[PDB]
Design an enzyme around this catalytic site. Structure first.
Site, PDB file in Angstrom:
ATOM      1  N   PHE A  18       0.913  -1.237  -0.027  1.00  0.00           N
ATOM      2  CA  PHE A  18      -0.246  -0.135  -0.418  1.00  0.00           C
ATOM      3  C   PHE A  18       0.763   1.107   0.283  1.00  0.00           C
ATOM      4  CE2 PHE A  18      -3.685  -2.311   0.680  1.00  0.00           C
ATOM      5  CZ  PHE A  18      -3.364  -3.370   1.128  1.00  0.00           C
ATOM      6  N   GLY A  19       2.205   0.837  -0.375  1.00  0.00           N
ATOM      7  CA  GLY A  19       2.910   2.667  -0.295  1.00  0.00           C
ATOM      8  C   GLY A  19       4.049   2.230   0.624  1.00  0.00           C
ATOM      9  N   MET A  82       8.547  -1.613  14.973  1.00  0.00           N
ATOM     10  CA  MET A  82       8.412  -3.066  15.581  1.00  0.00           C
ATOM     11  C   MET A  82      10.024  -2.072  15.003  1.00  0.00           C
ATOM     12  SD  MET A  82       6.267  -5.195  16.210  1.00  0.00           S
ATOM     13  CE  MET A  82       7.162  -6.297  16.809  1.00  0.00           C
ATOM     14  N   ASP A 126      -1.530 -14.268   4.155  1.00  0.00           N
ATOM     15  CA  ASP A 126      -0.386 -14.163   3.728  1.00  0.00           C
ATOM     16  C   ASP A 126       0.874 -14.392   4.583  1.00  0.00           C
ATOM     17  OD1 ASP A 126       1.710 -13.346   1.601  1.00  0.00           O
ATOM     18  OD2 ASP A 126       0.829 -11.444   0.971  1.00  0.00           O
TER      19      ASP A 126
HETATM   20  C1  LIG Z   1       5.110  -1.666  11.757  1.00  0.00           C
HETATM   21  N1  LIG Z   1       5.924  -1.522  11.114  1.00  0.00           N
HETATM   22  C2  LIG Z   1       5.527  -1.678   9.446  1.00  0.00           C
HETATM   23  C3  LIG Z   1       6.659  -1.457   8.715  1.00  0.00           C
HETATM   24  C4  LIG Z   1       8.746  -1.517   9.219  1.00  0.00           C
HETATM   25  C5  LIG Z   1       8.698  -1.069   9.957  1.00  0.00           C
HETATM   26  N2  LIG Z   1       9.944  -1.246  11.401  1.00  0.00           N
HETATM   27  C6  LIG Z   1      10.934  -1.093  10.739  1.00  0.00           C
HETATM   28  C7  LIG Z   1      11.979  -1.061  11.946  1.00  0.00           C
HETATM   29  C8  LIG Z   1      13.680  -0.264  11.344  1.00  0.00           C
HETATM   30  C9  LIG Z   1      13.175  -0.434  10.307  1.00  0.00           C
HETATM   31  C10 LIG Z   1      14.916  -0.770   9.175  1.00  0.00           C
HETATM   32  O1  LIG Z   1      15.332   0.407   8.352  1.00  0.00           O
HETATM   33  N3  LIG Z   1      15.999  -1.510  10.175  1.00  0.00           N
HETATM   34  C11 LIG Z   1      17.312  -1.314   9.546  1.00  0.00           C
HETATM   35  C12 LIG Z   1      18.036  -2.707   9.048  1.00  0.00           C
HETATM   36  O2  LIG Z   1      18.048  -3.154  10.704  1.00  0.00           O
HETATM   37  C13 LIG Z   1      16.724  -3.434  10.729  1.00  0.00           C
HETATM   38  C14 LIG Z   1      15.655  -2.123  10.713  1.00  0.00           C
HETATM   39  C15 LIG Z   1      12.320  -0.981   8.890  1.00  0.00           C
HETATM   40  N4  LIG Z   1      10.730  -1.163   9.871  1.00  0.00           N
HETATM   41  C16 LIG Z   1       7.319  -1.157  11.464  1.00  0.00           C
HETATM   42  O3  LIG Z   1       7.515  -1.471  12.352  1.00  0.00           O
HETATM   43  C17 LIG Z   1       6.389  -1.826   7.217  1.00  0.00           C
HETATM   44  C18 LIG Z   1       7.613  -0.857   6.388  1.00  0.00           C
HETATM   45  C19 LIG Z   1       7.304  -1.182   4.638  1.00  0.00           C
HETATM   46  C20 LIG Z   1       6.275  -1.903   4.938  1.00  0.00           C
HETATM   47  C21 LIG Z   1       5.923  -2.953   5.134  1.00  0.00           C
HETATM   48  N5  LIG Z   1       4.757  -3.513   5.222  1.00  0.00           N
HETATM   49  N6  LIG Z   1       5.459  -5.150   4.829  1.00  0.00           N
HETATM   50  C22 LIG Z   1       4.313  -5.968   3.454  1.00  0.00           C
HETATM   51  C23 LIG Z   1       2.879  -6.293   4.209  1.00  0.00           C
HETATM   52  C24 LIG Z   1       2.002  -7.073   3.618  1.00  0.00           C
HETATM   53  C25 LIG Z   1       0.770  -6.343   3.498  1.00  0.00           C
HETATM   54  C26 LIG Z   1      -0.258  -8.115   2.765  1.00  0.00           C
HETATM   55  C27 LIG Z   1      -1.441  -7.061   2.829  1.00  0.00           C
HETATM   56  C28 LIG Z   1       0.723  -7.204   1.053  1.00  0.00           C
HETATM   57  C29 LIG Z   1       0.321  -9.252   3.041  1.00  0.00           C
HETATM   58  C30 LIG Z   1       0.238  -5.377   2.754  1.00  0.00           C
HETATM   59  C31 LIG Z   1       1.473  -4.475   3.408  1.00  0.00           C
HETATM   60  F1  LIG Z   1       1.200  -2.710   3.858  1.00  0.00           F
HETATM   61  C32 LIG Z   1       2.630  -3.920   4.452  1.00  0.00           C
HETATM   62  C33 LIG Z   1       3.233  -3.495   4.499  1.00  0.00           C
HETATM   63  O4  LIG Z   1       3.416  -2.071   4.667  1.00  0.00           O
HETATM   64  C34 LIG Z   1       6.067  -2.914   6.500  1.00  0.00           C
HETATM   65  C35 LIG Z   1       4.862  -3.725   7.941  1.00  0.00           C
HETATM   66  C36 LIG Z   1       4.506  -3.571   8.826  1.00  0.00           C
HETATM   67  O5  LIG Z   1       2.917  -3.084   7.959  1.00  0.00           O
HETATM   68  C37 LIG Z   1       4.364  -1.980   8.616  1.00  0.00           C
END
Ligand SMILES: Cn1c2c(cc(Nc3ccc(C(=O)N4CCOCC4)cn3)c1=O)-c1cccc(-n3ncc4cc(C(C)(C)C)cc(F)c4c3=O)c1C[C@H](O)C2
Length: 263
Positions: A18-19, A82, A126
Protein backbone atom coordinates in the site's frame (compact mmCIF):
# COMPACT_ATOMS: atom_id res chain seq x y z
CA UNK A 1 -9.91 7.46 14.75
CA UNK A 2 -6.55 9.19 15.37
CA UNK A 3 -6.25 12.91 14.82
CA UNK A 4 -3.32 13.52 12.30
CA UNK A 5 -2.48 16.67 14.37
CA UNK A 6 -1.10 14.14 16.91
CA UNK A 7 1.33 12.53 14.49
CA UNK A 8 4.93 13.38 13.38
CA UNK A 9 6.73 11.87 10.42
CA UNK A 10 10.44 11.23 11.25
CA UNK A 11 12.02 8.50 9.08
CA UNK A 12 11.06 6.35 6.08
CA UNK A 13 10.76 2.62 6.88
CA UNK A 14 10.24 1.28 3.42
CA UNK A 15 7.48 0.61 0.90
CA UNK A 16 4.94 -2.25 0.79
CA UNK A 17 1.80 -3.20 -1.08
CA UNK A 18 0.00 0.00 0.00
CA UNK A 19 2.88 2.39 -0.50
CA UNK A 20 5.17 4.24 1.90
CA UNK A 21 5.52 3.51 5.60
CA UNK A 22 7.02 6.05 8.01
CA UNK A 23 8.29 5.95 11.61
CA UNK A 24 7.02 8.75 13.80
CA UNK A 25 5.60 9.71 17.11
CA UNK A 26 1.98 9.78 18.34
CA UNK A 27 1.02 12.34 21.03
CA UNK A 28 4.68 13.36 21.19
CA UNK A 29 5.49 10.27 23.24
CA UNK A 30 4.69 6.92 21.53
CA UNK A 31 6.64 5.29 18.70
CA UNK A 32 4.46 4.31 15.76
CA UNK A 33 4.63 3.15 12.25
CA UNK A 34 2.35 5.11 9.87
CA UNK A 35 1.17 3.33 6.71
CA UNK A 36 0.31 6.12 4.26
CA UNK A 37 -2.07 4.31 1.92
CA UNK A 38 -1.34 5.05 -1.72
CA UNK A 39 -4.21 6.17 -3.94
CA UNK A 40 -5.66 3.34 -5.96
CA UNK A 41 -3.90 0.59 -3.98
CA UNK A 42 -6.63 -0.25 -1.46
CA UNK A 43 -10.39 -0.88 -1.29
CA UNK A 44 -10.66 1.90 1.25
CA UNK A 45 -14.32 1.89 2.16
CA UNK A 46 -14.32 -1.84 2.78
CA UNK A 47 -11.16 -1.52 4.88
CA UNK A 48 -12.65 1.27 6.95
CA UNK A 49 -15.63 -0.86 7.87
CA UNK A 50 -13.29 -3.75 8.69
CA UNK A 51 -10.90 -1.55 10.77
CA UNK A 52 -13.74 -1.45 13.27
CA UNK A 53 -13.41 -5.27 13.97
CA UNK A 54 -9.61 -5.27 13.54
CA UNK A 55 -9.50 -2.70 16.41
CA UNK A 56 -10.73 -5.58 18.63
CA UNK A 57 -7.90 -8.01 17.71
CA UNK A 58 -5.34 -7.61 20.52
CA UNK A 59 -2.64 -10.07 21.44
CA UNK A 60 0.93 -9.57 22.61
CA UNK A 61 2.34 -11.41 19.47
CA UNK A 62 0.17 -9.50 17.02
CA UNK A 63 1.36 -6.08 15.84
CA UNK A 64 -1.11 -3.74 17.61
CA UNK A 65 -3.40 -1.54 15.61
CA UNK A 66 -3.54 1.88 17.30
CA UNK A 67 -5.96 3.57 14.94
CA UNK A 68 -6.68 5.01 11.56
CA UNK A 69 -6.98 8.45 9.93
CA UNK A 70 -9.87 8.32 7.56
CA UNK A 71 -11.24 11.90 7.35
CA UNK A 72 -8.70 12.55 4.62
CA UNK A 73 -6.62 11.19 1.73
CA UNK A 74 -4.35 9.44 1.76
CA UNK A 75 -5.81 7.43 4.69
CA UNK A 76 -3.34 6.35 7.36
CA UNK A 77 -3.05 3.15 9.37
CA UNK A 78 -1.17 3.62 12.70
CA UNK A 79 0.43 0.62 14.40
CA UNK A 80 2.93 -0.50 16.98
CA UNK A 81 6.52 0.18 15.90
CA UNK A 82 8.82 -2.86 15.62
CA UNK A 83 12.38 -1.57 15.80
CA UNK A 84 14.17 -4.50 14.11
CA UNK A 85 11.95 -4.62 11.03
CA UNK A 86 10.76 -7.60 9.02
CA UNK A 87 11.67 -11.15 10.17
CA UNK A 88 12.85 -12.17 6.73
CA UNK A 89 15.71 -9.63 6.60
CA UNK A 90 16.48 -10.24 10.31
CA UNK A 91 16.94 -14.01 9.68
CA UNK A 92 19.32 -13.24 6.79
CA UNK A 93 21.80 -11.26 8.92
CA UNK A 94 24.56 -13.67 9.89
CA UNK A 95 25.75 -11.46 12.78
CA UNK A 96 22.79 -12.60 14.96
CA UNK A 97 24.30 -16.11 14.97
CA UNK A 98 21.10 -17.61 16.31
CA UNK A 99 20.91 -20.62 18.58
CA UNK A 100 18.28 -23.16 17.55
CA UNK A 101 16.25 -22.45 20.77
CA UNK A 102 16.00 -18.82 19.53
CA UNK A 103 14.68 -20.06 16.18
CA UNK A 104 12.06 -22.24 17.91
CA UNK A 105 11.04 -19.27 20.10
CA UNK A 106 10.41 -17.21 16.91
CA UNK A 107 8.14 -20.05 15.67
CA UNK A 108 6.38 -20.07 19.05
CA UNK A 109 5.79 -16.30 19.01
CA UNK A 110 4.13 -16.56 15.56
CA UNK A 111 2.11 -19.69 16.59
CA UNK A 112 0.71 -17.90 19.65
CA UNK A 113 -0.48 -15.05 17.48
CA UNK A 114 -1.96 -17.46 14.93
CA UNK A 115 -3.73 -19.53 17.67
CA UNK A 116 -5.35 -16.25 18.81
CA UNK A 117 -6.49 -15.39 15.27
CA UNK A 118 -7.81 -18.97 14.77
CA UNK A 119 -9.78 -18.55 18.03
CA UNK A 120 -11.41 -15.46 16.40
CA UNK A 121 -11.97 -17.31 13.11
CA UNK A 122 -9.81 -14.67 11.45
CA UNK A 123 -7.51 -15.66 8.47
CA UNK A 124 -4.20 -14.01 7.75
CA UNK A 125 -3.97 -15.23 4.13
CA UNK A 126 -0.37 -14.04 3.67
CA UNK A 127 1.62 -15.48 6.58
CA UNK A 128 5.33 -15.49 5.64
CA UNK A 129 8.55 -14.16 7.23
CA UNK A 130 8.37 -10.97 5.09
CA UNK A 131 5.03 -10.26 6.86
CA UNK A 132 6.26 -10.72 10.41
CA UNK A 133 8.19 -8.07 12.36
CA UNK A 134 10.72 -8.09 15.21
CA UNK A 135 10.74 -5.65 18.08
CA UNK A 136 13.65 -4.26 20.15
CA UNK A 137 13.49 -7.26 22.51
CA UNK A 138 13.71 -9.76 19.59
CA UNK A 139 10.08 -10.80 19.90
CA UNK A 140 8.41 -11.72 16.60
CA UNK A 141 4.87 -10.51 15.93
CA UNK A 142 2.46 -11.16 13.07
CA UNK A 143 1.61 -8.09 10.89
CA UNK A 144 -0.86 -7.09 8.12
CA UNK A 145 -3.19 -9.99 8.93
CA UNK A 146 -6.47 -9.80 7.00
CA UNK A 147 -5.36 -6.84 4.82
CA UNK A 148 -4.91 -8.94 1.67
CA UNK A 149 -8.68 -8.66 1.20
CA UNK A 150 -8.37 -4.96 0.38
CA UNK A 151 -5.47 -5.12 -2.15
CA UNK A 152 -6.49 -3.76 -5.61
CA UNK A 153 -3.48 -5.08 -7.60
CA UNK A 154 -4.44 -8.06 -9.73
CA UNK A 155 -0.83 -9.27 -9.84
CA UNK A 156 -1.12 -9.89 -6.04
CA UNK A 157 -4.73 -11.14 -5.79
CA UNK A 158 -4.76 -13.54 -8.79
CA UNK A 159 -3.38 -16.95 -7.96
CA UNK A 160 -1.58 -16.77 -11.43
CA UNK A 161 -0.18 -13.31 -10.66
CA UNK A 162 3.45 -12.34 -10.23
CA UNK A 163 3.02 -11.17 -6.60
CA UNK A 164 0.70 -13.94 -5.33
CA UNK A 165 2.28 -15.87 -2.38
CA UNK A 166 2.58 -19.11 -4.40
CA UNK A 167 5.35 -20.65 -2.31
CA UNK A 168 3.33 -20.27 0.94
CA UNK A 169 0.02 -21.56 -0.48
CA UNK A 170 -1.41 -25.09 -0.22
CA UNK A 171 -2.48 -27.03 -3.35
CA UNK A 172 -6.21 -26.41 -2.77
CA UNK A 173 -5.65 -22.61 -2.82
CA UNK A 174 -3.55 -22.75 -5.99
CA UNK A 175 -5.92 -25.08 -7.82
CA UNK A 176 -9.36 -24.18 -6.46
CA UNK A 177 -9.18 -20.92 -4.44
CA UNK A 178 -10.12 -23.00 -1.35
CA UNK A 179 -9.11 -20.73 1.59
CA UNK A 180 -9.61 -21.94 5.14
CA UNK A 181 -7.88 -22.11 8.54
CA UNK A 182 -5.88 -24.85 6.98
CA UNK A 183 -4.34 -22.66 4.29
CA UNK A 184 -2.79 -20.46 7.05
CA UNK A 185 -1.57 -23.72 8.71
CA UNK A 186 0.27 -24.65 5.45
CA UNK A 187 1.88 -21.11 5.31
CA UNK A 188 2.95 -21.46 8.93
CA UNK A 189 4.87 -24.66 8.10
CA UNK A 190 6.63 -22.76 5.25
CA UNK A 191 7.41 -19.89 7.65
CA UNK A 192 9.03 -22.41 10.09
CA UNK A 193 11.13 -23.63 7.13
CA UNK A 194 12.14 -20.02 6.38
CA UNK A 195 13.17 -19.54 10.04
CA UNK A 196 15.26 -22.74 10.20
CA UNK A 197 16.83 -21.97 6.84
CA UNK A 198 17.86 -18.46 8.00
CA UNK A 199 15.69 -16.77 5.42
CA UNK A 200 16.29 -18.82 2.25
CA UNK A 201 13.55 -18.56 -0.39
CA UNK A 202 11.35 -21.71 -0.17
CA UNK A 203 11.87 -23.97 -3.19
CA UNK A 204 15.03 -21.92 -3.86
CA UNK A 205 15.85 -23.55 -7.17
CA UNK A 206 12.31 -23.47 -8.61
CA UNK A 207 10.01 -20.85 -10.12
CA UNK A 208 6.49 -20.21 -8.75
CA UNK A 209 5.03 -22.28 -11.64
CA UNK A 210 7.36 -25.18 -10.91
CA UNK A 211 6.64 -24.97 -7.18
CA UNK A 212 2.86 -25.22 -7.87
CA UNK A 213 3.49 -28.33 -9.97
CA UNK A 214 6.01 -29.95 -7.42
CA UNK A 215 3.62 -29.57 -4.43
CA UNK A 216 0.50 -30.81 -6.26
CA UNK A 217 2.56 -33.98 -6.99
CA UNK A 218 3.35 -34.48 -3.31
CA UNK A 219 6.81 -33.23 -2.98
CA UNK A 220 7.73 -31.01 -0.01
CA UNK A 221 10.47 -28.76 1.30
CA UNK A 222 13.52 -30.64 2.59
CA UNK A 223 14.61 -30.50 6.27
CA UNK A 224 16.83 -27.43 6.91
CA UNK A 225 20.11 -28.41 8.56
CA UNK A 226 19.29 -26.54 11.77
CA UNK A 227 15.93 -28.35 12.26
CA UNK A 228 15.91 -31.52 14.41
CA UNK A 229 13.80 -34.44 13.34
CA UNK A 230 11.14 -33.24 15.87
CA UNK A 231 11.08 -29.67 14.44
CA UNK A 232 10.86 -31.09 10.94
CA UNK A 233 7.92 -33.29 11.92
CA UNK A 234 6.07 -30.15 13.15
CA UNK A 235 6.59 -28.13 9.92
CA UNK A 236 5.92 -31.18 7.73
CA UNK A 237 2.56 -31.88 9.51
CA UNK A 238 1.36 -28.47 8.18
CA UNK A 239 1.79 -29.79 4.59
CA UNK A 240 -0.61 -32.77 4.54
CA UNK A 241 -2.34 -33.06 1.16
CA UNK A 242 -5.68 -33.37 3.05
CA UNK A 243 -6.39 -30.02 4.68
CA UNK A 244 -8.46 -31.66 7.35
CA UNK A 245 -5.51 -33.77 8.41
CA UNK A 246 -3.36 -30.66 9.11
CA UNK A 247 -3.17 -29.60 12.82
CA UNK A 248 -4.76 -26.52 14.31
CA UNK A 249 -2.61 -23.71 15.73
CA UNK A 250 -3.59 -24.87 19.22
CA UNK A 251 -2.16 -28.31 18.43
CA UNK A 252 0.99 -26.78 16.84
CA UNK A 253 1.58 -24.66 19.94
CA UNK A 254 1.46 -27.72 22.20
CA UNK A 255 3.84 -29.47 19.75
CA UNK A 256 6.30 -26.57 19.81
CA UNK A 257 6.24 -26.37 23.65
CA UNK A 258 6.85 -30.15 23.95
CA UNK A 259 9.85 -29.84 21.57
CA UNK A 260 11.24 -26.85 23.54
CA UNK A 261 11.10 -29.00 26.70
CA UNK A 262 12.77 -31.88 24.81
CA UNK A 263 15.61 -29.72 23.35
C1 LIG B 1 4.92 -1.71 11.85
N1 LIG B 1 6.05 -1.60 10.90
C2 LIG B 1 5.89 -1.65 9.55
C3 LIG B 1 6.92 -1.70 8.67
C4 LIG B 1 8.29 -1.59 9.15
C5 LIG B 1 8.42 -1.44 10.51
N2 LIG B 1 9.67 -1.33 11.23
C6 LIG B 1 10.94 -1.19 10.68
C7 LIG B 1 11.95 -1.00 11.70
C8 LIG B 1 13.22 -0.84 11.21
C9 LIG B 1 13.52 -0.89 9.85
C10 LIG B 1 14.92 -0.75 9.30
O1 LIG B 1 15.05 0.01 8.36
N3 LIG B 1 15.96 -1.50 9.80
C11 LIG B 1 17.36 -1.35 9.25
C12 LIG B 1 18.10 -2.72 9.28
O2 LIG B 1 18.04 -3.33 10.59
C13 LIG B 1 16.69 -3.74 10.84
C14 LIG B 1 15.80 -2.48 10.94
C15 LIG B 1 12.46 -1.06 8.93
N4 LIG B 1 11.19 -1.20 9.40
C16 LIG B 1 7.34 -1.45 11.47
O3 LIG B 1 7.43 -1.36 12.69
C17 LIG B 1 6.74 -1.85 7.20
C18 LIG B 1 7.49 -1.08 6.36
C19 LIG B 1 7.40 -1.21 5.01
C20 LIG B 1 6.46 -2.08 4.48
C21 LIG B 1 5.73 -2.86 5.33
N5 LIG B 1 4.76 -3.77 4.76
N6 LIG B 1 5.10 -5.15 4.82
C22 LIG B 1 4.25 -6.10 4.48
C23 LIG B 1 2.95 -5.72 3.97
C24 LIG B 1 2.09 -6.76 3.54
C25 LIG B 1 0.81 -6.39 3.10
C26 LIG B 1 -0.11 -7.44 2.55
C27 LIG B 1 -1.59 -7.08 2.78
C28 LIG B 1 0.25 -7.65 1.08
C29 LIG B 1 -0.04 -8.76 3.27
C30 LIG B 1 0.42 -5.08 3.08
C31 LIG B 1 1.28 -4.13 3.49
F1 LIG B 1 0.86 -2.84 3.47
C32 LIG B 1 2.57 -4.36 3.96
C33 LIG B 1 3.50 -3.32 4.41
O4 LIG B 1 3.28 -2.11 4.46
C34 LIG B 1 5.80 -2.79 6.73
C35 LIG B 1 5.05 -3.71 7.68
C36 LIG B 1 3.98 -3.09 8.59
O5 LIG B 1 2.84 -2.92 7.80
C37 LIG B 1 4.45 -1.65 9.00
Amino acid sequence: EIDPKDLTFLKELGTGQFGVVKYGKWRGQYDVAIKMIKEGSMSEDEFIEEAKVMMNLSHEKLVQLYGVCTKQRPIFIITEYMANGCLLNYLREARHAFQTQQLLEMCKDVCEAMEYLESKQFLHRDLAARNCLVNDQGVVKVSDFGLSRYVLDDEYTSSVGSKFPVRWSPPEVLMYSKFSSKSDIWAFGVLMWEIYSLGKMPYERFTNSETAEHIAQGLRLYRPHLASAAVYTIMYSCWHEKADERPTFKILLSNILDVMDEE
